[PDB]
Design a protein around this ligand. Structure first.
Ligand SMILES: Nc1ncnc2c1ncn2[C@@H]1O[C@H](COP(=O)(O)OP(=O)(O)OP(O)(O)=S)[C@@H](O)[C@H]1O
Ligand SMILES: Nc1ncnc2c1ncn2[C@@H]1O[C@H](COP(=O)(O)OP(=O)(O)OP(O)(O)=S)[C@@H](O)[C@H]1O
Ligand SMILES: Nc1ncnc2c1ncn2[C@@H]1O[C@H](COP(=O)(O)OP(=O)(O)OP(O)(O)=S)[C@@H](O)[C@H]1O
Ligand SMILES: [Mg+2]
Ligand SMILES: [Mg+2]
Lengths: 117, 436, 109, 422, 420
C-alpha cells in the first residue's frame, strides 16, 4: 500500500539512525526533526529492488508523499530505480505529472553483466 | 463611522445566533416545538422526571441549537442543579463511548465541588453502580446520531441507559437526535420495550410566508445600538413587504429548491460584510445583485464550469470519448478506441477544408487530467467506503486493473454525449460532432 | 404537414391559409402517435404572478381579455387559459378574487 | 473589520475570506470549505492572506505529509500546545503526551485537558487550524469528514480560546456528498488562457532574468548593455509564446507550466544570437525545433533471448483468439484493440511447438524463460502471485501492446499480421 | 456506593407537586404478583429443593420481553435472604466482550482480578475440588451465544459436577434457543424443564395497573389555588376512569402482552392531561379532576401514527419533483430500481412534455452570467436530503450515472402522498 511502504521504511532508517547515534512516531515527523533528533543532517537513498512488479499508482502516490519533504532543506533525497529492463515500459505506467517531476536530473546508467562481452 | 461598523457587529452575531441567551431568537414556525421540549426538559430537572425522548428531523434543523438553548436558558437560574453529558455517535464508537461517559463525569465533579481508572468493563460496572444506586443531582444526556449506536450486532449501550430510566433513583433524561426517520423499527424488541416510545418530529417551513416571517425576525434588530438602526429597520421590511422586490423574489427561489433557512442564512453573511459604508449596504439589499455573484460562485465548478475551462484538445478528446461510448451496450470504451476515433474525427476536418493532430505519447498527459476531472470513471470502482474498516479491507487487496496497462483500463462515462450538445455552443467547430 | 395545412385551408371555404390552422394540424400529428405536482406548481406560480399583476396597479376594474393581452405579450407563446380559469376558480374558492360577470374581474377588499 | 490583502485574480474571493474570517470568534463561522482543483493557488491565496494579517494566529497542518487519521490526531494535539507555548509563555502547563492519543475520543479528551489551564486569558481569542489537501488523504472514507465537523461542539463552548477549522480539499464530487451540512463554501474557479499567462509572467520573471544560464550567455556573446527591461522583454516574449504553442497540450495548469518552462529554457538560451535580442520574431524562427515537440519522454528492442522471443510471439496469439477456433486453424493435418483473453498452461507449448523453426524437443530452457517473463511482468497471473506453479486453476495473460509485439516479430524475422484476420 | 454521597446537593427550592406528579411517582416502573403467581412457585419449588440439599441444577425460562422474568427471579432470591448464597446478575448485554463475564465470577468468589483465561482455570478448579451455594442469573442469552458456542458449553458443564456448589438460572428470549443456535450436546445439558412464560392477559393487565394505583386511585389531595401544588385553597380529588384503563389493556394484551408497554402508555396518557390542565390555568414550574377516555385514545394512537406522509408534503418542490419522476420510471419499466442518470434524463424531459419561469429558476437562480446548467439546481442536495432521511437509498459507486437507486418506504404511499 502507500501506508506500510512508508511505515516500514521509516522504521528501517530509524534503527540505522540510533546505531550511529550512541517513543517516536514512524512517519515524516522524524524527517524534519532529524536535525534536532540526531544532530547532523540526512541524505537517504532508496534501493527499489524490483520496480516493475509494484503497482505503479502506489509508487506514483508514494513519490508525491516524498515531494512534500522538499521544504526543510536539511535533508537530501536520492532514488535508485533498479529496473530489470524496458525503460519505455516505465514511462507508460506512471502518471505524467510525476514523470515531469522525475525528469529534472535523470541519469540512464547501464549496468549489465553482458555489455559488449 | 464605527457606528455603522457597530451595526455590523450586531447584525453578524444575530446571523450566527451568538448573542447572550436572553436575546437568542427562535423563529415562529417552531416556537411550539421548543415549548414541548421545554415541558419535557424542565420538569425532568425541577420536577425530577425520568423520561426519555427522541428528536427526529433532517440536517441543519436547529436540533443541537434547540437543546443547548434550553441549557443556557436553565444555566442562568439552575446552575448547580444539573450536569450535562454530550455524546456524538460520530465521534464515539461502541466501546470508547464508555470511556467517553466516565471521563466527562469526573470533570463535572470538580465543577460541582478514581472513576476512569481500571479496565473498560471495570469502569462500566462502576458507572452502573454509581447511577442505578437536600436533593439529588439530575443528569441530562445529549446524544447526536443515536441511529449509529442502533446497529445490528450488539446495541449494548442503548440497553443500559434505557434501563436506567426504570430502576435508578438518580433522575435522568435521554435525548436522541437523528435524521433516519423510522428510527423505531431500527431498534430490536428488547430495547424498544425499554424505550418510552415518545418521539417528536421537527417542523419544516410549510408555507412560503413562514420563512418570510422568519427572515424578518432574523434580520431585524430590536435593541438600540447604532443611530443607523431605525433607518436600517424600515429598509428591511420595505424590501420584504414588496412581493415584486428582488430580495423577496430571491427568497422565493430558496423556498423552492432548498426550503431550508441556513442555506439562505449563509448567503447574507458576505452580503452584509462586503459593504463599507451605510448607504452601500442599503443598496445591496435593494439590488441583491451580489446574490447572483454568490450563486455563480457556488455553481462555478461543479460540472459546467469544469467543461467551460478546458482547451481545444481536451474538448476534442472527450467529444470523441462519448462517440465511442454511444456504440457499445454498456458504454465502456478503451483508450485505443478513443484515439482511433479521435484520429478518424481529425481525418474529416482537414478534408472538408490546418489543425495540429497530436501524437500518441502526449494525449496521455491530457488523459491524466480528464480522469481526475471526473469526466470519466473506472468501470468497476467503488469510490468511497462508508467507514474505516471497510476501507482498510480495500487497501490490502491487490488490484487487477493496474496489472493491465494504462491504455486498456476500461474507462466509462460520467457526462453523456447528448448532453454535450446543449452546453457546447454552435460557434465551436466540433458542434457537428456533438450530435452523431 | 404543408399538405395537411392546405387541406385545413381547403375546408371552411378559405383561399388564404391562416396561422391558427397549422396549430390543430400539429396537434393532429401529435395526438395520432400520442393533478401533477408540476401542474400544481404551475397553478401556484400562476396564482402568485396573477396576484402580483392584479394588485400592483391602482385600477383593479379590468376584465379577462385585457388580462390575457397584458400578461402574455411581453413573453413568448400561449400558456393554457383553462389553467388560468382553474386558478381563478381556486381563488374564487379561497375568496381572493370575485368574478362579478364577464366584463370586470376584481379582487377581494 | 480586517486588513485585506490584494492579489491578481481573487478579487471576489479575497473579500469572502475576509468576510468569513475575523479575529473575533462569535462572528467567525465554525467550519469552512475552500474548494478547487489543483492549479488555482489556494495554498497560495490562503497564506497570502495570512501574511497580511499578523493579528490573528494560524496553525498550519499538512495532511498530505501524513498517511492516516491516527497520526492526524497526533498531528493536531502536538501543535496546539506547541503554538500556545509560543503565544502565552507566562501560562504554566501540565504538558501532555501527543503520542498518547490514537482515537477520536482522545482528542477532545485531551483538548478538554489542554484548554482548561488557559482559562485565565483576557478576551475570547480564536485560533484557526488549517488542513491542506483533505481529499488526497490516502485512507479516507465517508465517515471521516463529518467526524471532524462536530469536533467544535464537543469542546466546552465557554472557554477563552476557541478552535475553528478551515478545510482544503479537491475533487468536487466529494463535496457533493456533504452539501446537506450546508457549511459555508468558497469555490475557486479554474483559469482562462490569458490569466494563466498573466499569473505566469509575474511569477517567473524573478528567476529567468536572474538565472546564470542567461548571465553566462550575457558575457559569452558580445554583450551590448541590454537593459533589465530588455531582459524583461525576451522573458516576456518567451512566456507569451510558450503558453501559445503548448496550451492545448497542458490545459489550464500552473504546475505543468512551471516545469516545462524549466526544461525548454536553456535550450532556448543557446539558440539566441547577439543580434536577435532586438529581433524576437526571427529568434522564434531559429529556435523553432523545441516549440513543436514535448520533450517529456526521457521503444526498446527487448533484451530477451531467441527462444524467449518466440515464447512471447506465441503468447500474443491468444489475444483475440479463443479455444473454439484455434485448434482448427492451426492444424497439423478486430481484437487488436480489445483487452486480451485468458490463457491456461500448455496451450503455449501447443502453439510454441508449431511455430518454431522436431527441430526442438528439450523444454528445460523453455520453462526457464516463462518465469523470466513473469518477473518482467509481461505475462502475469490472473490470481494472486503465489500458488501459480502447481497446476491448480491458474489463468494467464499478456500485458504488452501490439507495437512492441510487431517490432519483435520482425526482429526474429517472423510474420504475425497474416494470422490476425478480422 | 462511594459517589452517591457526592451525587447529593443541598438547595432544593420547593418543587411544585401537582395533581399528576404523584401519579408518575408510583407510575415509575419500580414500586407477590398477580399474573405470574403460581409460576413464581414453580421456579421457587424447583429452587428451594436444590438450595436446601446442596446440589447443582439448571432452570430455563423463556418469553418475550416485558413479562416479568427480569422481575420474578429477583423476587425469588429476595425472600431467600431471610432463610448461604452469593447473588450475581450476570447480564449478557452488559458485558462488553463476551468473555468478560468470566472475570466477574472469579471476582465474585474471593475478590481477585484475573483474565478470562486465568479465571476459568480457577473456576474449573473450584467446581470439582471444593468440599461441602452460588446463585447466578445468566440474563439475555442472545448476547453470549454469538461467536462459537465455546462459552455456552462451559456454563452448563459446570452444572454436571456433583461437587459443584452452583445454581444456574437461564433466562432467554425464545424457547427455541437451544434448538436453533446451540448444539444437541448443550441441549442434553439444558434439561427439559423449560418453564414457558406467555403474555399477560387483558384482565390481569387491569390487575397490574391498580397495584400501582393502590393508595391513590380516587383519593384526595390538598391544594392551594395559587401555585397548583397538591398535598396528599381547596381539597380536591382526582379519579381515574377504569374503562379507559381497560381499553389500554385490550390493546397491549392484544399486540404484545408487555408489562412495560402497558404502564408507559398509561404514563404517556397521564401527561397529556397534565399539560392541558396547565394550559387552562398556568401554575408553571416553581371541581373534581379526572382523566378522560379521550386521553388514552390519542396516546395509544401516538404509538402508531407516522409523519413521513406529512414530511413529504412539507418537503421542497424539487423533492416532490424528484419522487414523481421516480415513480414514473417504476411504472415505465416495472423494475423498481432505476439508474441515476435516467432520473436526470427524466427531469429534463418532464419539463417540456409559468413552466418557463420555473425552468429559468430550476437550472439557475436567475443570473444570465451563470446559467446553462446540466443537472438541476441543488440536485446533489435533495438527493443527499432524501438519503439521510431514510426515504431513499442509493448504493455506493464513483460513477454518478449508473449507480442504482432503491426505494425504502412503500411506493404506493409515495404515490399517495404525491397526490397532495
Ligand atoms: N454554538 C452555536 N450557537 C448557536 N447556533 C448554533 C451553534 N452551533 C450551531 N448553531 C446553529 O445550528 C444550526 C444547524 O442545526 P444543528 O442542529 O446544529 O445541526 P442539525 O443538522 O440540525 O443537527 P446536527 O448538528 O446535524 S446533529 C444552524 O442554524 C447554526 O447556526
Ligand atoms: N493570483 C496569483 N498571483 C500569483 N501567483 C498565483 C496566483 N494564483 C496562483 N498563483 C500561483 O499558483 C501556484 C499554485 O499553488 P498551489 O496552491 O499549490 O496550487 P493548487 O491549486 O493549490 O494545488 P494544490 O497545492 O494541490 S492545493 C502558487 O504557487 C502561485 O505561485
Ligand atoms: N406482575 C408484575 N407485577 C408488578 N410489576 C410488574 C409485573 N410484571 C412486570 N412488572 C413491571 O414491569 C417491568 C417489566 O420488566 P420485566 O418484564 O421484568 O423484564 P422482562 O420481562 O425480562 O423484559 P426484558 O428484561 O427486556 S427480557 C418490571 O421491571 C416491573 O417494574
Ligand atoms: Mg496548493
Ligand atoms: Mg439470567
Amino acid at each position: 500500500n502507500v501506508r506500510m511502504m512508508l511505515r516500514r521504511s521509516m522504521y528501517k532508517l530509524y534503527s540505522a539512525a540510533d546505531a550511529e547515534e550512541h517513543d517516536v512516531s514512524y512517519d515524516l515527523s522524524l524527517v524534519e526533526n532529524f536535525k534536532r533528533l540526531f544532530g547532523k543532517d540526512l541524505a537517504m537513498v532508496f534501493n527499489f529492488k524490483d520496480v516493475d512488479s509494484i503497482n505503479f499508482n502506489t509508487l506514483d502516490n508514494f513519490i508525491i508523499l516524498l515531494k512534500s519533504a522538499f521544504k526543510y532543506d536539511h535533508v537530501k533525497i536520492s532514488l535508485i530505480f533498479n529496473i530489470n529492463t524496458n525503460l519505455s515500459n516505465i514511462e507508460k505506467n506512471l502518471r505524467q505529472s510525476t514523470i515531469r517531476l522525475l525528469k529534472r536530473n535523470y541519469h540512464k546508467l547501464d549496468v549489465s553483466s553482458n555489455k559488449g562481452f | 463611522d464605527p457606528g455603522f461598523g457597530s451595526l455590523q457587529r450586531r447584525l453578524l452575531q444575530q446571523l450566527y445566533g451568538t448573542l447572550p441567551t436572553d436575546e437568542k431568537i427562535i423563529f415562529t414556525y417552531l416556537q411550539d416545538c421548543q415549548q414541548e421540549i421545554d415541558r419535557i426538559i424542565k420538569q425532568s430537572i425541577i420536577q425530577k422526571e425520568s423520561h426519555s425522548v427522541i428528536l427526529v428531523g433532517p440536517r441543519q434543523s436547529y436540533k443541537t441549537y434547540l437543546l443547548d438553548y434550553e441549557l443556557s436558558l436553565l444555566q442562568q437560574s439552575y446552575k448547580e442543579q444539573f450536569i450535562t453529558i454530550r455524546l456524538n455517535g460520530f465521534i464515539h464508537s461502541e466501546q470508547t463511548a464508555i470511556n467517553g461517559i466516565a471521563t466527562q463525569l469526573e470533570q463535572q465533579l470538580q465543577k460541582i465541588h478514581t472513576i476512569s481508572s481500571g479496565s473498560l468493563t471495570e469502569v462500566f460496572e462502576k458507572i452502573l453502580l454509581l447511577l442505578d444506586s437536600i436533593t439529588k443531582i439530575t443528569v441530562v444526556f445529549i446524544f447526536d446520531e443515536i441511529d449509529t449506536f442502533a446497529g445490528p450486532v450488539r446495541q449494548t449501550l442503548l440497553y443500559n441507559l434505557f434501563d436506567m430510566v426504570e430502576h435508578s433513583r438518580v433522575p435522568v433524561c435521554i435525548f436522541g437526535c437523528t435524521t433516519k426517520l423510522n428510527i423505531l423499527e431500527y431498534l430490536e424488541k428488547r430495547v424498544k420495550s425499554r424505550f418510552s416510545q415518545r418521539v417528536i418530529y421537527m417542523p419544516q417551513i410549510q408555507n412560503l410566508d413562514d420563512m418570510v416571517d422568519a427572515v424578518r425576525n432574523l434580520l431585524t434588530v430590536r435593541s438600540e445600538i447604532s443611530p443607523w438602526v431605525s433607518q436600517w429597520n424600515e429598509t428591511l421590511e420595505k424590501e420584504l413587504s414588496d412581493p415584486r422586490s428582488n430580495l423577496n423574489r430571491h427568497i422565493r427561489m430558496n423556498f423552492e429548491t432548498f426550503r431550508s433557512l441556513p442555506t439562505l442564512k449563509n448567503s447574507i453573511i458576505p452580503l452584509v460584510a462586503t459593504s463599507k459604508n451605510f448607504g452601500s449596504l442599503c443598496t445591496a439589499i435593494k439590488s441583491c445583485s451580489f446574490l447572483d455573484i454568490y450563486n455563480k460562485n457556488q455553481l462555478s465548478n461543479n460540472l459546467t464550469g469544469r467543461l467551460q475551462s478546458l482547451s481545444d484538445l481536451e474538448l476534442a478528446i472527450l467529444i470523441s470519448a462519448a462517440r465511442v461510448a454511444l456504440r457499445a451496450k454498456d458504454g465502456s470504451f478503451n483508450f485505443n478506441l478513443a484515439y482511433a476515433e479521435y484520429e478518424k474525427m481529425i481525418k474529416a476536418i482537414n478534408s472538408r477544408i490546418t489543425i495540429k493532430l497530436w501524437l500518441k505519447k502526449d494525449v496521455k498527459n491530457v488523459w491524466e487530467n480528464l480522469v481526475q476531472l471526473d469526466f470519466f470513471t473506472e468501470k468497476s470502482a467503488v469510490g468511497l467506503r462508508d467507514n474505516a474498516t471497510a476501507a482498510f479491507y480495500a487497501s490490502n487487496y491487490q488490484f487487477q486493473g493496474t496489472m493491465i496497462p494504462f491504455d486498456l483500463r476500461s474507462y466509462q462515462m460520467q457526462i453523456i454525449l447528448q448532453e454535450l450538445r446543449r452546453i457546447i455552443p454552435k460557434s465551436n467547430m466540433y458542434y457537428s460532432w456533438t450530435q452523431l | 404537414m404543408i399538405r395537411l395545412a392546405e387541406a385545413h385551408a381547403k375546408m371552411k371555404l378559405k383561399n388564404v391559409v391562416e396561422l391558427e390552422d397549422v396549430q390543430e394540424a400539429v396537434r393532429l400529428i401529435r395526438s395520432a402517435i400520442k393533478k401533477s405536482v408540476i401542474q400544481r406548481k404551475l397553478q401556484e406560480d400562476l396564482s402568485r404572478e396573477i396576484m402580483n399583476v392584479l394588485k400592483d396597479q391602482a385600477s383593479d376594474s379590468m376584465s379577462f381579455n385585457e388580462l390575457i393581452k397584458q400578461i402574455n405579450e411581453h413573453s413568448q407563446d400561449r400558456v393554457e387559459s383553462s389553467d388560468i380559469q382553474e386558478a381563478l376558480s381556486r381563488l374564487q374558492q379561497e375568496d381572493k378574487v370575485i368574478v362579478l360577470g364577464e366584463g370586470v374581474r376584481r379582487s377581494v377588499r | 473589520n480586517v486588513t485585506t490583502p490584494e492579489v491578481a485574480f481573487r478579487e471576489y474571493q479575497t473579500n469572502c475570506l475576509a468576510s468569513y474570517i475575523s479575529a473575533d470568534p462569535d462572528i467567525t463561522p465554525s467550519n469552512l470549505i475552500l474548494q478547487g482543483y489543483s492549479g488555482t493557488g489556494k495554498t497560495y491565496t490562503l497564506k497570502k492572506y495570512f501574511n497580511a494579517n499578523p493579528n490573528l494566529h494560524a496553525v498550519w497542518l499538512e495532511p498530505v505529509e501524513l498517511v492516516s487519521w491516527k497520526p492526524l490526531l497526533q498531528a493536531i494535539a502536538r501543535t496546539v500546545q506547541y503554538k500556545l507555548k509560543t503565544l502565552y509563555p507566562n501560562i504554566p502547563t501540565t504538558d501532555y503526551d501527543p503520542l498518547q492519543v490514537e482515537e477520536p475520543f482522545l482528542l477532545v479528551k485531551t483538548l478538554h485537558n489542554i484548554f482548561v489551564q488557559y482559562e485565565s486569558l483576557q478576551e475570547k481569542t480564536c485560533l484557526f487550524l488549517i488542513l491542506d489537501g483533505f481529499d488526497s488523504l490516502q485512507d479516507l472514507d465517508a465517515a471521516l469528514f463529518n467526524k471532524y465537523i462536530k469536533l467544535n461542539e464537543l469542546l466546552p463552548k465557554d472557554s477563552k480560546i476557541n478552535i475553528k477549522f478551515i478545510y482544503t480539499m479537491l475533487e468536487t464530487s466529494f463535496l457533493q456528498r456533504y452539501s446537506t451540512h450546508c457549511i459555508p463554501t468558497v469555490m475557486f474557479p479554474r483559469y482562462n488562457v490569458d490569466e494563466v499567462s498573466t499569473i505566469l509572467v509575474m511569477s517567473r520573471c524573478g528567476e529567468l532574468m536572474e538565472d546564470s544560464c542567461l548571465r553566462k550567455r550575457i558575457i559569452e556573446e558580445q554583450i551590448t548593455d541590454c537593459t533589465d527591461d530588455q531582459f524583461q522583454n525576451v522573458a516576456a516574449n518567451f512566456i507569451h509564446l510558450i503558453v501559445q504553442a503548448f496550451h492545448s497540450y497542458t490545459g489550464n495548469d500552473i504546475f505543468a507550466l512551471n516545469d516545462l518552462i524549466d526544461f525548454k529554457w536553456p535550450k532556448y538560451v543557446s539558440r539566441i544570437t547577439k543580434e536577435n535580442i532586438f529581433e524576437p520574431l526571427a529568434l522564434y524562427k531559429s529556435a523553432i525545433k523545441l516549440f513543436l515537440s514535448t520533450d517529456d519522454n526521457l521503444s526498446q528492442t527487448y533484451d530477451l533471448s531467441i527462444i524467449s522471443k518466440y515464447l512471447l510471439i506465441a503468447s500474443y496469439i491468444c489475444s483475440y483468439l479463443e479455444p473454439r477456433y484455434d485448434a482448427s486453424i492451426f492444424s497439423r493435418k478486430n481484437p487488436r484493440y480489445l483487452q486480451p483473453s485468458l490463457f491456461a498452461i500448455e496451450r503455449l507449448l501447443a502453439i510454441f511447438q508449431a511455430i518454431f523453426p522436431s527441430l526442438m524437443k528439450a523444454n528445460i530452457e523453455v520453462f526457464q524463460n516463462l518465469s523470466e517473463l513473469h518477473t518482467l511482468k509481461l505475462i502475469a497471473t490472473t490470481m494472486n502471485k503465489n500458488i501459480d506453479y502447481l497446476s491448480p486453476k491458474v489463468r494467464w495473460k499478456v500485458n504488452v501492446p501490439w507495437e512492441i509485439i510487431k517490432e519483435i516479430s520482425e526482429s526474429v524475422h517472423f510474420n504475425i499480421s497474416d494470422y490476425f484476420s478480422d | 456506593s462511594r459517589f452517591e454521597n457526592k451525587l447529593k446537593t443541598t438547595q432544593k427550592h420547593q418543587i411544585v407537586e401537582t395533581i399528576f406528579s404523584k401519579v408518575k411517582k408510583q407510575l415509575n416502573s419500580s414500586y407477590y404478583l398477580p399474573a405470574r403467581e403460581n409460576e413464581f412457585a414453580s421456579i421457587y419449588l424447583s429452587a428451594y429443593s436444590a438450595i436446601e440439599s446442596d446440589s447443582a441444577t439448571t432452570i430455563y425460562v423463556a418469553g418475550t420481553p416485558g413479562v416479568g422474568k427480569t422481575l420474578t427471579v429477583r423476587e425469588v432470591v429476595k425472600e431467600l435472604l431471610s432463610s448461604d448464597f452469593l447473588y450475581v446478575e450476570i447480564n449478557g448485554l452488559k458485558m462488553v466482550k463476551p468473555t468478560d463475564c468470566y472475570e466477574t465470577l472469579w471476582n465474585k468468589v474471593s475478590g481477585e482480578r484475573l483474565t478470562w483465561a486465568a479465571s476459568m482455570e480457577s473456576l474449573e478448579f473450584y467446581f470439582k475440588r471444593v468440599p461441602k451455594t452460588i446463585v447466578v442469573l445468566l440474563d439475555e442469552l442472545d448476547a453470549m451465544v454469538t461467536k462459537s458456542q465455546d462459552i455456552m458449553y462451559n456454563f452448563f458443564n459446570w452444572t454436571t459436577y456433583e461437587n459443584a456448589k452452583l445454581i444456574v438460572i437461564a433466562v432467554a428470549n425464545t424457547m427455541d434457543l437451544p434448538e436453533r443456535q446451540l448444539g444437541n450436546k448443550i441441549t442434553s445439558r439444558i434439561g427439559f424443564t423449560r418453564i414457558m412464560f406467555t403474555g399477560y392477559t387483558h384482565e390481569e393487565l387491569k390487575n397490574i395497573i391498580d397495584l400501582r394505583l393502590k393508595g391513590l386511585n380516587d383519593s384526595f389531595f390538598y391544594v392551594d389555588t395559587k401555585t397548583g401544588n397538591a398535598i396528599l385553597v381547596r381539597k380536591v380529588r382526582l379519579r381515574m376512569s377504569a374503562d379507559a384503563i381497560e381499553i389500554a389493556s385490550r390493546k397491549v394484551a392484544s399486540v404484545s402482552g408487555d408489562a412495560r408497554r402497558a404502564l408507559k402508555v398509561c404514563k404517556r396518557a397521564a401527561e397529556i392531561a397534565e399539560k392541558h390542565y396547565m394550559a387552562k390555568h398556568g401554575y408553571g414550574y416553581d371541581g373534581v379532576q379526572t382523566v378522560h377516555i379521550t386521553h388514552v385514545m390519542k396516546a395509544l394512537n401516538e404509538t402508531l401514527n407516522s409523519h413521513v406522509i406529512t414530511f413529504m408534503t412539507r418537503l421542497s418542490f424539487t423533492a416532490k419533483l424528484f419522487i414523481y419522476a421516480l415513480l414514473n420510471l417504476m411504472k415505465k419499466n416495472g423494475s423498481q430500481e432505476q439508474e441515476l442518470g435516467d432520473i436526470v434524463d427524466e427531469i429534463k424531459l418532464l419539463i417540456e412534455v409559468f413552466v418557463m419561469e420555473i425552468a429559468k429558476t430550476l437550472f439557475q437562480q436567475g443570473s444570465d452570467n451563470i446559467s446553462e446548467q446540466l443537472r438541476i439546481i441543488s440536485w446533489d442536495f435533495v438527493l443527499n436530503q432524501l438519503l439521510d432521511a431514510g426515504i431513499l437509498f442509493k448504493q455506493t459507486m464513483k460513477n454518478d450515472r449508473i449507480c442504482c437507486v432503491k426505494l425504502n418506504i412503500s411506493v404506493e404511499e409515495a404515490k399517495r402522498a404525491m397526490n397532495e
